[PDB]
Design a protein around this ligand. Sequence first.
Ligand SMILES: Nc1ncnc2c1ncn2[C@@H]1O[C@H](COP(=O)(O)OP(=O)(O)O)[C@@H](O)[C@H]1O
Ligand SMILES: Nc1ncnc2c1ncn2[C@@H]1O[C@H](COP(=O)(O)OP(=O)(O)O)[C@@H](O)[C@H]1O
Ligand SMILES: Nc1ncnc2c1ncn2[C@@H]1O[C@H](COP(=O)(O)OP(=O)(O)O)[C@@H](O)[C@H]1O
Ligand SMILES: Nc1ncnc2c1ncn2[C@@H]1O[C@H](COP(=O)(O)OP(=O)(O)O)[C@@H](O)[C@H]1O
Ligand SMILES: [Mg+2]
Ligand SMILES: [Mg+2]
Ligand SMILES: [Mg+2]
Ligand SMILES: [Mg+2]
Ligand SMILES: [Mg+2]
Ligand SMILES: [Mg+2]
Ligand SMILES: [Zn+2]
Lengths: 53, 30, 272, 273, 273, 273
Amino acid sequence: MVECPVCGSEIEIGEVELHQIVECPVCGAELEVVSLEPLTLEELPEVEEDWGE
Amino acid sequence: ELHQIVELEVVSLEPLTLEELPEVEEDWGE
Amino acid sequence: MRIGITYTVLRREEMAIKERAGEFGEVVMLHEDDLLFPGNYDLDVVIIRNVSHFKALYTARLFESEGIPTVNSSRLIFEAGDKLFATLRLAGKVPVPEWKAALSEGGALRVPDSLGYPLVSKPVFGSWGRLLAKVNDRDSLEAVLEHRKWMKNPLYGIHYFQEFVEKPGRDIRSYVIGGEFVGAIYRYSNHWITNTARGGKAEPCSDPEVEELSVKAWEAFGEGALAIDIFESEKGLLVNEVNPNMEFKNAARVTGADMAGKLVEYAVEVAK
Amino acid sequence: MRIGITYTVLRREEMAIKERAGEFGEVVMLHEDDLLFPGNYDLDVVIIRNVSHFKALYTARLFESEGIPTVNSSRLIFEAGDKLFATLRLAGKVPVPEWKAALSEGGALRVPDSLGYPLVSKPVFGSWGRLLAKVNDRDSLEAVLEHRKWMKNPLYGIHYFQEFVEKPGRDIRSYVIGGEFVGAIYRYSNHWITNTARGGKAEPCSDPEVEELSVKAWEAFGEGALAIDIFESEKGLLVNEVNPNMEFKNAARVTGADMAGKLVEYAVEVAKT
Amino acid sequence: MRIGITYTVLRREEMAIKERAGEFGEVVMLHEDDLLFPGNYDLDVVIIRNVSHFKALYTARLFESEGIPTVNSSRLIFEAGDKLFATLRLAGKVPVPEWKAALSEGGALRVPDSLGYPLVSKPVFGSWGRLLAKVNDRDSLEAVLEHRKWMKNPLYGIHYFQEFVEKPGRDIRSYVIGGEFVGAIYRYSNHWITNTARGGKAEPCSDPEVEELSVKAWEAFGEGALAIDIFESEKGLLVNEVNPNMEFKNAARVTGADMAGKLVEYAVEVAKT
Amino acid sequence: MRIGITYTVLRREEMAIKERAGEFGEVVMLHEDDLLFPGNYDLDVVIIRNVSHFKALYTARLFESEGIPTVNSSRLIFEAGDKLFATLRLAGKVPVPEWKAALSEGGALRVPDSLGYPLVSKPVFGSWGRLLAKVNDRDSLEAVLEHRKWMKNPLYGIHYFQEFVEKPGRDIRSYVIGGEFVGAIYRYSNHWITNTARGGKAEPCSDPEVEELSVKAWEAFGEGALAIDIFESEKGLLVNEVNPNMEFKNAARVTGADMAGKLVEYAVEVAKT
Ligand SMILES: Nc1ncnc2c1ncn2[C@@H]1O[C@H](COP(=O)(O)OP(=O)(O)O)[C@@H](O)[C@H]1O
Ligand SMILES: Nc1ncnc2c1ncn2[C@@H]1O[C@H](COP(=O)(O)OP(=O)(O)O)[C@@H](O)[C@H]1O
Ligand SMILES: Nc1ncnc2c1ncn2[C@@H]1O[C@H](COP(=O)(O)OP(=O)(O)O)[C@@H](O)[C@H]1O
Ligand SMILES: Nc1ncnc2c1ncn2[C@@H]1O[C@H](COP(=O)(O)OP(=O)(O)O)[C@@H](O)[C@H]1O
Ligand SMILES: [Mg+2]
Ligand SMILES: [Mg+2]
Ligand SMILES: [Mg+2]
Ligand SMILES: [Mg+2]
Ligand SMILES: [Mg+2]
Ligand SMILES: [Mg+2]
Ligand SMILES: [Zn+2]
């Protein structure tokens, strides 16, 4: 398990990879796995003017 | 079955014989 | 549950309907030769599949007279099966092509003043795209009226017309049973008349707007199992006609939707 | 087979692509921090998934310079990802909305004379519906041009406009990979800007005409994996835009099509080229 | 012959180009306000002279879309005008300073691993010595990357670096037009950044070695009119950069070379096709 | 009692403040969407928690214009939130690191004659350790100045510098609310920038020297709830900066102090007068 930085809840996200995008099951926060060795979630950086498809 | 259309119409069972479908009328369809 | 099916020939339609009816209860296959009224029929509901529209209409009414409910009802078969009665019912509720009706040749000659050219002339009771005419000018209008005049049927003296709608090489055919959308297809053709009966090719249509419009069009009648014909125009979707003895073999094949099952499930709902 | 995947973050898309790639050979996950050139890479193909369009473009070119083929190519990322270059390539081959391009505020002021109001203003390099403006009159045109002028990016000084198309509450998003149509959706919204990014709702689209037109639009480029944007109008279908770093998670869910697998299959085809 | 000249302002270079063009045919002066596409132009060639690099690139592409050839072409303006795309085409063909490219701040931190210190940081699309930084240690690298990070233009997220070359108080600027060496100057400065735009002082350069190297650098591209930047170093001459919208008023004044005339003669050759 | 809380995003601290208020009266949560002026608000005091310093400033001023007091006040947000205005207010009263301000690039180039190398360049309005530079030599000073120039936010035209202070692997963040010391922490890092936003780790600080110095710093302003940044140096404690939008979640966690509760108490206190 790990703490959501928006909500504060402890959640299970499963077998994640580094820089992977996850949705918090409680608050619906979109988050980035910024570390695995110490499992750390983080809110995404700001959208740049050339981000997308 | 006694009126199946097959690739026309089965008219008879006892002696099984096929036959062409009847004339298309002006109110036939859906 | 005891379910009657009236038929002329056992098309793919009727075989599938029989199988599905057999899952609910007892099936009684009634060829037109078995239809004689007044008579004694032991049936909870009758599914009306006669190929002739008028024979469908009268056999529904006759079973109704024996207290046996019918899918479709005689009322729906008449209202939806007549193009004029059906568009009058639709026009309140959904967009339809501009249309005109006249009761004589002289009145019919004024229709271009409202509709303009080209227009479409079609009989009020037809199916399979028969006797449809695209009329581009007055000479053509006169020719169609002259030929309609010399035909036997007094129903050809009800003159029904629509604006010719520029469709994108296809039209849409939708199915709504008991108020539930069951599926839709595009019917493609190189000719402006797109019926599968005249060689139209079916492709699956998942457009959510045709689903919405189709349900609304069904709601104009409020009962039964209908095949619905929709045109795509530069003004958007238009409901053209509604059909109360639906063919579906190709639509079912192309969409994977179970039109026969939904039909039967609705009939037994109607029976009880 | 060593298949590189180049990424900023791992969205559903990238997770699914990684899965599919693993069935064909060894996958090398390459975060942006891992990208250093000239470098010593041992790769048969790289699938370019960077969230930044310009980072995607430059990493594709760099891998090409190491002799490693790229999906999509740097040439396609640039042409397809620029609205103006893409429109130029599309204009021969498929219907597109009426458009104009001007190189100054002064020249942009004449655009209504050609296109009429309302018109749409958009930056040549954006995505997700960013900086799209519906300009209904001269006062709005001036405000829009004044703001674009003050913005830092010199690219905002390339003034690209289109006629405003009156859509029926939705637009169409289709996918063509290596010349094969893989699927399409409608994107519904109460607002005229329909991207799922803000956030249009996806429904499957089985329209065979969008399939035929999407393949034609792809053929104007003649390579790669493209997400195509199409509008319905009273004059018929119009091709608006093509996107060389496709998102598809909703499109995939709603159509049941395997966009990710098709992208990876195409990548193994170019790896063997 | 109708020769177009596209421009932002008419510098000395543009006035000279205009005069020479007038010897070969009718000259159509096209300010940016006069550029609107699609449009009807009656022109056999356009000489692209917009001060903005990006406006030059897009205006070339738009004239090409109208079937009007352009000097320089959109392809050359894009590739030559980008530090990274340009060194990629120069690499293996002529000697260049040691370089490194990264695609993120975290990747850029590793650039000194290859290049050592001091190194040179520069933006990929710049000119006139703009935003050039000499970075002597880790703290300076961090400061530069911190600032690039917060700048709006996504292009500042492409991190391009060279070894710092110890030049003898000057660098070299040469000109090659259609394969013909037309002249060269030294640019002297007591600052390591020698651009004449920043106070650099022009002096004629007659080293036969720079002529041959200059032509070879041009042949890496194979078309157009290029101002080439060369460095003298302890390991001989290195090609640093090429520039597709050449300034030359100081170079022509100091060498007597008619860069304007040669540019127009090349334009007239491309007009014939 | 009716206590307004103004916020950008609901998180731990805002939620902690919400519950401590409410023990005093009715709490009204005001998202930035709810802020429209002139407007009819029925509040006795507003606790200003907007993440943007600028939005906080204007929000405070706007509530004051409706006769509603604000914690912190617009004046304090202005003076304390701007680093130069703040150090000017501190200059007489408490030791600060040596500093210098210039109004142009040319003046800024003279700064190291006063401060020596290494020195620290930072924006007057920044937080979270963003755009900090440690400048070890002239080349780096030039680089930082070049980049500031091309950001073209007029605020970066104020060039604020400090001597680089050699801290022992950490710095200090103390909290003073209405003149009462509520707690302090150490922030540890092996980078010279020790922000917890930057990955710094917080521990409790019990040093009475910093408690004394914290209250003295607060007193230079004479109002509000402030977070106070202190450095330990070779020449004793120094007050680096003050912050009128105190984040405290780590400080409260690690100290056990009720920052939320103290803040609310002060606000009800402010509501009285
Ligand atoms: N007004 C019209 N404009 C364009 N096409 C039409 C029009 N009316 C009919 N059609 C074409 O002819 C076909 C048959 O028309 P219709 O008679 O209304 O249905 P049916 O004869 O099948 O009961 C339609 O499916 C359509 O393709
Ligand atoms: N000319 C236009 N007329 C009508 N709607 C438009 C027009 N241009 C864009 N839109 C709407 O805005 C959306 C985003 O525009 P698009 O050109 O695809 O840019 P992006 O690359 O940001 O998606 C489209 O999907 C469509 O819904
Ligand atoms: N790696 C380097 N070593 C030494 N001097 C350099 C280096 N890169 C650039 N310079 C100096 O800065 C000037 C401008 O750099 P350049 O790469 O030509 O960019 P621009 O397009 O801005 O002219 C050069 O003419 C040269 O004097
Ligand atoms: N002059 C300086 N000397 C040494 N370290 C400094 C100096 N200025 C700032 N720092 C370090 O950087 C951190 C952030 O700087 P600060 O001035 O507080 O800006 P911000 O308001 O962005 O936090 C400080 O907590 C300190 O660790
Ligand atoms: Mg019909
Ligand atoms: Mg029909
Ligand atoms: Mg796009
Ligand atoms: Mg789009
Ligand atoms: Mg240059
Ligand atoms: Mg140069
Ligand atoms: Zn959460």
